[PDB]
Design an enzyme around this catalytic site. Structure first.
Site, PDB file in Angstrom:
ATOM      1  N   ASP A   1      -6.250   8.523  -0.370  1.00  0.00           N
ATOM      2  CA  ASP A   1      -5.781   7.503   0.567  1.00  0.00           C
ATOM      3  C   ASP A   1      -4.561   8.004   1.378  1.00  0.00           C
ATOM      4  O   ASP A   1      -3.685   8.639   0.821  1.00  0.00           O
ATOM      5  CB  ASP A   1      -5.363   6.272  -0.218  1.00  0.00           C
ATOM      6  CG  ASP A   1      -6.523   5.603  -0.944  1.00  0.00           C
ATOM      7  OD1 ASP A   1      -7.729   5.801  -0.664  1.00  0.00           O
ATOM      8  OD2 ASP A   1      -6.199   4.789  -1.806  1.00  0.00           O
TER       9      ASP A   1
ATOM     10  N   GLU B   1       0.822  -1.229   0.000  1.00  0.00           N
ATOM     11  CA  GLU B   1       0.000   0.000   0.000  1.00  0.00           C
ATOM     12  C   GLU B   1       0.849   1.269   0.000  1.00  0.00           C
ATOM     13  O   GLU B   1       0.559   2.213  -0.711  1.00  0.00           O
ATOM     14  CB  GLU B   1      -0.980  -0.025   1.163  1.00  0.00           C
ATOM     15  CG  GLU B   1      -2.096  -1.105   1.013  1.00  0.00           C
ATOM     16  CD  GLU B   1      -3.190  -0.756  -0.005  1.00  0.00           C
ATOM     17  OE1 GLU B   1      -3.140   0.353  -0.522  1.00  0.00           O
ATOM     18  OE2 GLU B   1      -4.052  -1.612  -0.338  1.00  0.00           O
TER      19      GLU B   1
ATOM     20  N   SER C   1     -11.548  11.270  -3.717  1.00  0.00           N
ATOM     21  CA  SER C   1     -11.124  10.915  -2.391  1.00  0.00           C
ATOM     22  C   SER C   1      -9.583  10.735  -2.400  1.00  0.00           C
ATOM     23  O   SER C   1      -8.959  10.758  -3.459  1.00  0.00           O
ATOM     24  CB  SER C   1     -11.845   9.658  -1.889  1.00  0.00           C
ATOM     25  OG  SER C   1     -11.508   8.563  -2.712  1.00  0.00           O
TER      26      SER C   1
ATOM     27  N   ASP D   1     -15.503  -4.539   9.294  1.00  0.00           N
ATOM     28  CA  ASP D   1     -16.674  -3.977   8.601  1.00  0.00           C
ATOM     29  C   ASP D   1     -17.465  -4.983   7.771  1.00  0.00           C
ATOM     30  O   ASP D   1     -18.505  -4.645   7.196  1.00  0.00           O
ATOM     31  CB  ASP D   1     -16.269  -2.784   7.717  1.00  0.00           C
ATOM     32  CG  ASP D   1     -17.434  -1.797   7.471  1.00  0.00           C
ATOM     33  OD1 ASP D   1     -18.168  -1.455   8.427  1.00  0.00           O
ATOM     34  OD2 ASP D   1     -17.611  -1.342   6.318  1.00  0.00           O
TER      35      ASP D   1
ATOM     36  N   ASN E   1      -8.918   5.447   3.218  1.00  0.00           N
ATOM     37  CA  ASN E   1      -9.575   6.305   2.235  1.00  0.00           C
ATOM     38  C   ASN E   1     -10.494   7.376   2.873  1.00  0.00           C
ATOM     39  O   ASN E   1     -11.221   7.076   3.805  1.00  0.00           O
ATOM     40  CB  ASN E   1     -10.350   5.420   1.246  1.00  0.00           C
ATOM     41  CG  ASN E   1     -11.061   6.230   0.183  1.00  0.00           C
ATOM     42  OD1 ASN E   1     -12.223   6.575   0.330  1.00  0.00           O
ATOM     43  ND2 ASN E   1     -10.364   6.591  -0.846  1.00  0.00           N
TER      44      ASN E   1
ATOM     45  N   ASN F   1      -7.564   9.363  -5.494  1.00  0.00           N
ATOM     46  CA  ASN F   1      -8.408   8.496  -6.332  1.00  0.00           C
ATOM     47  C   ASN F   1      -9.216   9.259  -7.374  1.00  0.00           C
ATOM     48  O   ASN F   1      -9.391  10.462  -7.264  1.00  0.00           O
ATOM     49  CB  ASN F   1      -9.334   7.686  -5.436  1.00  0.00           C
ATOM     50  CG  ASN F   1      -8.576   6.945  -4.364  1.00  0.00           C
ATOM     51  OD1 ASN F   1      -8.868   7.062  -3.181  1.00  0.00           O
ATOM     52  ND2 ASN F   1      -7.585   6.193  -4.778  1.00  0.00           N
TER      53      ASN F   1
ATOM     54  N   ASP G   1     -12.378   9.359  -7.920  1.00  0.00           N
ATOM     55  CA  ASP G   1     -13.604   9.940  -7.384  1.00  0.00           C
ATOM     56  C   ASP G   1     -13.368  11.197  -6.535  1.00  0.00           C
ATOM     57  O   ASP G   1     -14.328  11.763  -6.016  1.00  0.00           O
ATOM     58  CB  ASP G   1     -14.392   8.905  -6.582  1.00  0.00           C
ATOM     59  CG  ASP G   1     -13.703   8.515  -5.273  1.00  0.00           C
ATOM     60  OD1 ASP G   1     -12.600   9.000  -4.968  1.00  0.00           O
ATOM     61  OD2 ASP G   1     -14.270   7.705  -4.541  1.00  0.00           O
TER      62      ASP G   1
END
Ligand SMILES: [Pt+4]
Ligand SMILES: [Pt+4]
Ligand SMILES: [Pt+4]
EC number: 3.2.1.17
Length: 129
Positions: free
Chosen positions: A52, A35, A50, A101, A59, A46, A48
């Protein structure tokens, strides 16, 4: 801070990640390696809008507030900048919420693609823990 492999393994173990929700330490070290290449200061934008953040590339769409992701949810209740610290505490605490989650470590795309079903124990091999 750029961690060494064994240094990070030790920090993650101290912070309660070894076997957290069934995921051995090696999984967490492998995810961090792909990562962020063990750099707490890693950021990546990203498509969209957003971003990280940090060692585990958490995110801003769901997990943290960066003031620039319209309709973000801030589920870890933390500024995203806190995830860039040399102290991994915030990142670890947030990662624990993420992995709980429902999708386990599949939430981390590099873990799915590069660690899952590999010999992850190799990532902690030789370390003093
Ligand atoms: Pt230790
Ligand atoms: Pt620590
Ligand atoms: Pt926001």
């Amino acid at each position: 801070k750029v961690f060494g492999r064994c240094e990070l393994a030790a920090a993650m173990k101290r912070h309660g990640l070894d076997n957290y929700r069934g995921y051995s330490l090696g999984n967490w070290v492998c995810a961090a390696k792909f990562e962020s290449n063990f750099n707490t200061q890693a950021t990546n934008r990203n498509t969209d809008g957003s971003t990280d953040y940090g060692i585990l590339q958490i995110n801003s769409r769901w997990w943290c507030n960066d003031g620039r992701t319209p309709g973000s949810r801030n589920l870890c209740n933390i500024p995203c900048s806190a995830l860039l610290s040399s102290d991994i505490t915030a990142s670890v605490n947030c990662a624990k919420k993420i992995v709980s989650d429902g999708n386990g470590m599949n939430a981390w795309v590099a873990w799915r693609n590069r660690c899952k079903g590999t010999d992850v124990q190799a990532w902690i091999r030789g370390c003093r823990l």
